Amino acid sequence: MEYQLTLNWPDFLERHWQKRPVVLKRGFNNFIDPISPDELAGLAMESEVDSRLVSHQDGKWQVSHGPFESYDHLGETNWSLLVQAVNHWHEPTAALMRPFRELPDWRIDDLMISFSVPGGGVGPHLDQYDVFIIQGTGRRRWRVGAALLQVDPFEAIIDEELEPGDILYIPPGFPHEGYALENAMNYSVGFRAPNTRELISGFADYVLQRELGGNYYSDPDVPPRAHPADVLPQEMDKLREMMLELINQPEHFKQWFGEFISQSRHELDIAPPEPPYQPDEIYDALKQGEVLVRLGGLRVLRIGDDVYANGEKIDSPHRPALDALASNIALTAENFGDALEDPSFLAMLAALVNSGYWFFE
């Protein structure tokens, strides 16, 4: 099954995105939850899954981290189960992502799902990132204040009670708070952006690991000074320009970024097939009609001519086939065209499959 977003994108972009929060009434028409509260909890029981439980009694809070052996000593009110990146683990929930590809893939994060009993929620906070909160079964009251991870109470600019299929969009910076009125499922479609710090330090590691930027400062026309202990401004400029020059070299930064943002912020369900596929086995499967499916949560992005998957750079002369890898979550032989006839390309595919990044049926 799949989901249709009822929403005017150019307007939402013009007037809300990264600017102003809004509640989209029945954004999803006749919304059907892709996962039961039961399924969700059973999933948080597993260790590879980043979950959390938030409770408030007597005015004080209580976070407990997953996984979870028992699901009692728990009240009937005032707690919330929050599970990170469920699109990594449950094929149906990953479909909630697809209608947001009107926003660029590289900026999309994953999907957090929360389950709360009446009164349950996390209290007033703010996020560094864009979010869409989709209301599933039940009902929740959400408050959002103007812009200024706990914060002090705030006057609300939006105060609404979401009904199934409603979507609350919140830009980064706006404080929000939400709690359940009946037993509620919320699906947060989250976004990500790097800060300058993450950029500078990650690019440095690439430079360092790959032995680049190995040219030395040279001063054949070394300037005079009055005090030998001084470092002069022009000298400082020269050092700066070495750094600018390296950042601006056409290939290196592009190539590092690709390897950086193509990585996920949460653990993937990587399960290498045994025995490994032969490039022939891949060819046969495809031509027989089998469907090659991308692993949930696995980011695949194109920067110029290169394509990157979970850190790996992928190069191939078959531009349209390679495009298919990045745009379709489910691939068939037609998507590849005559690229399947190049054994170099089959080989490349087979590697990706053996790494666990795509799998059959």
Added chain:
Amino acid sequence: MEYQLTLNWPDFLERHWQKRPVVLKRGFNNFIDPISPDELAGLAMESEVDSRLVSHQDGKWQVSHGPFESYDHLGETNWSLLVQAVNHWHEPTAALMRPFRELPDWRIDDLMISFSVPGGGVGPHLDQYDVFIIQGTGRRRWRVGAALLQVDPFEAIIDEELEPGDILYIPPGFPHEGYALENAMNYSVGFRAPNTRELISGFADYVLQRELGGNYYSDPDVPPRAHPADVLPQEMDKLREMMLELINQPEHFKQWFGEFISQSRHELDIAPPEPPYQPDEIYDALKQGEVLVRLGGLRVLRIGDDVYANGEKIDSPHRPALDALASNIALTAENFGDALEDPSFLAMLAALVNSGYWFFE
């Protein structure tokens, strides 16, 4: 005692520095070695000292690292003892440095001293750095080739036999080779420069340790694209500009560099006094005529208004007193003027002394 360099600096800079090697005949007139071969070897016996022994027999080489218990099983020919940063450990040798402050302090490294028996030396190599090799007692034949850490044999553009007080200058990149003809002391005054790699990775650590560059990429006018998996050039530009912007912020980079180049490339002889000095004790000493002496090898550099010593930033409103710290290896009360009357400044001095960076007599 102290040393006088007989040499025309503007010409040497115009025509040789970072351009072309040259032998300066009797650069030091009536040269007296500041250290015996005995003293040198005894010093390499100590563990805090970076030494090395290079031998060749039968065509093959043999490096052994310090320190050294016994000084036999050693031939009469074909070996060399090389000791790193002797200016850190032997007050007299540190004076060989002073006449090179016609070149900027920040570019000067330390002083390596080698002792070789006839035939001893390291064979054909090249360095990434400028050097002046001063010939002490004895005689050595040095060869230098044109420019292109072992290398293949080379035709020589300079082939000379140095006599005491001669100085061989070699820019970075030029292959050289030298061996003893009689028992020879060589004093290498070494230089240093950073590469872009060292810059980018060190600045990143500063950004990271000090919690800077924490602004996030924002795209309120996020661009349209045909394939949602693409990252567009303008997006890449925006990311780059975040990095340029941070490097160019007036204070941060200046401040990091200061903390970086003010550090030594070899271990210092840091010996914190016990008990610590009181700011009064410092004041008294100075006014009584005692001489405050900078620890050997300790770099002290000024960048704009700030002054940096072995990593520490030093700020004080007494600009000329602070200047004295960077220009004089030996300080007296006069050097400080009325800054000694500010207890804030005495306090600052006392800290530096207790760290072991300066000491009395």
